[PDB]
Amino acid sequence: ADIMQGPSESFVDFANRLIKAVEGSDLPPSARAPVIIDCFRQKSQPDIQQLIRTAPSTLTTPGEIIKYVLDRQKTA
Amino acid sequence: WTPLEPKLITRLADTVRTKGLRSPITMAEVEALMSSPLLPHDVTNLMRVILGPAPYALWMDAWGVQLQTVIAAATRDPRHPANGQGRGERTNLNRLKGLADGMVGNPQGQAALLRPGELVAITASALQAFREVARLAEPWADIMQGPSESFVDFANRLIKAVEGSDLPPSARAPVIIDCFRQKSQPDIQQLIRTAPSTLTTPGEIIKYVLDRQKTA
Amino acid sequence: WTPLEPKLITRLADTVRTKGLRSPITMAEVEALMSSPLLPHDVTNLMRVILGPAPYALWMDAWGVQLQTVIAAATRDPRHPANGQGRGERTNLNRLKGLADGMVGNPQGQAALLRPGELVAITASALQAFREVARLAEPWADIMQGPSESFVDFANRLIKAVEGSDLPPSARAPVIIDCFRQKSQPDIQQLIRTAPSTLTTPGEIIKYVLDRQKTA
Amino acid sequence: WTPLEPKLITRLADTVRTKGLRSPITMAEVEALMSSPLLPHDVTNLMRVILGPAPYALWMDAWGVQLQTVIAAATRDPRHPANGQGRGERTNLNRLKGLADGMVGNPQGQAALLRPGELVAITASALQAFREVARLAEPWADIMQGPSESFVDFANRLIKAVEGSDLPPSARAPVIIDCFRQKSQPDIQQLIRTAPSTLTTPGEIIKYVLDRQKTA
């Protein structure tokens, strides 16, 4: 719950770090995917936050969110 | 047909006006006025009076969607308390929304032709739609205990934001505990860390912290 | 005949005095006190007490016009619940307005000679007349979303002004949509413009905007 | 095959250059040079010459889309004047866009294999695509009658912007009327308001206002 995407960090590194810390924690197995999704939505600095918010489709899996963000990310 | 008291409706409208749509007291009051099975006329006028124009539009949409899900389940099971055994008792959405023949604008005829199963299904649908619109109209991982904030205020805010969120019901307690441990500025963090007993419930953590907190 | 409580009438009069004629709470209260079929005496005295002099004149006019439309429909169909089968039961406006023989000023005789269909027709006519006068007493193309206003308030105001206007019923939804798109200050304008799906209903636009709105 | 005169094409290009794409004189000139059924080569070169690069790209897109709609209607009806009775005469988009075998770059062979129905369908498609691109390249609820502007100019501008917009066809007349009533600065507003007759058509409103307008 203390993991933020740094201003200069890429998104795949942030996703790796977050999934690592969530799966290697004390949560039940059935609570990891919703937590990872809701942490993608609230962390992951406001450009990607708005990118996920304005998703014409409903993303219901961390893999789908990662794919969508990697497709439509701001190349920089 | 007997109408609901305008006094109760006025009190409920003022409750919605002061407390909002999402307060637990407001939902309790709505559950109270949603006790007896209401006719489509009753629920429609009730939501017209207690809700503003835009929430009323949202609620009409949500009520239609929930009634459509109900009718899909009804065509998926001929034993619906709204349905009958033969095909001539199948319930159309015109009969649920009060749009069928002999019902449009007339609550007496409505009460005549409607089934009790129809009434309870309409009522449950309207309640779920109200819940959806209330959750829609007006972030737990961003909540920190301020440097000057007390611990009971922080716990109240955190439990509110966690229970009023999109998490499953079985994932709220572990999240509340792990947010008590990682938020709640490092004095209380160390106070929880050095707990000779194992705290496995938000209430127990709150009690322990309130006992051993630094009076200041 | 049993009169309405002066306590309820006093509360309704104060409601009309503070909230106005057009508030949804006021219309709900009027619908409440318009539950049982009232005799012309009851509705006339009720409007005399709750309405001021000029709104009362307007309401008398509108009630007469609506009752005349009802009597035209009645002479257009001999199966009116106010009419009878033979020509001797045809209902004249003197019997509807309470001006017929044996009714002028006497509520007991009124309740004696009147039909239940007559009562419900009079009541519906009076309700529609009240709605007309309320819409008349105290512009949709001039509505803009203020810089600080939320979107649900703007949608409520716009839908209210569009539905309570002179447009045909089949032209309200396209106008509401095209006003959502061109009003609703450029942040929401761009939010609606860049919609990967096609939004073809005010409810769908409202849901989409409420989902993807900039929390602030 | 006979080519179009480069003199007419030069005059049309200068017309498009000075008047623009959307002027009624330009559309009339295009309709003039779109009189005889043209081969894909002719229309393609014509749009290459009269349109700039970006409008030409837009026009290629729109022409393709309209031709695809035509081919969908053609597979939805075997009696298309471009089709034949058997399946061997079905018209592919390569034959419409001039991309089929024996046609690529050769206008003589094009004119040989093409049908007159094919030619007229291609021509109508190209005209509709030109209209779309012209409407796209260079807001009706923002139109006001200026303090010094005459009423026929305001009516022309308003009807243009309303008919060339995203409204359904059945919603243009009520919108034009209600915009005449609320725009069109308060002298004409009061002139329309105090109309002893009920005006239920934009033409009737225009005639009435032109009759009773304040000569100045």
UniProtKB/Swiss-Prot annotation, chains B, C, D:
Signal peptide: none annotated. Self-associates to form the irregular polyhedron core composed of hexamers and pentamers, that encapsulates the genomic RNA-nucleocapsid complex. Assembles as a tube in vitro. Binds to inositol hexakisphosphate (IP6), which allows the assembly of the polyhedral capsid. This is Capsid protein p27, alternate cleaved 1. The gene is gag. Residues 41-49, 102-113 are annotated as: Involved in capsid protein dimerization. The record marks D166, D178 as: Involved in capsid protein dimerization upon acidification. It comes from the Viruses. It is found in: Virion. Homodimer. Homomultimer. Homohexamer.
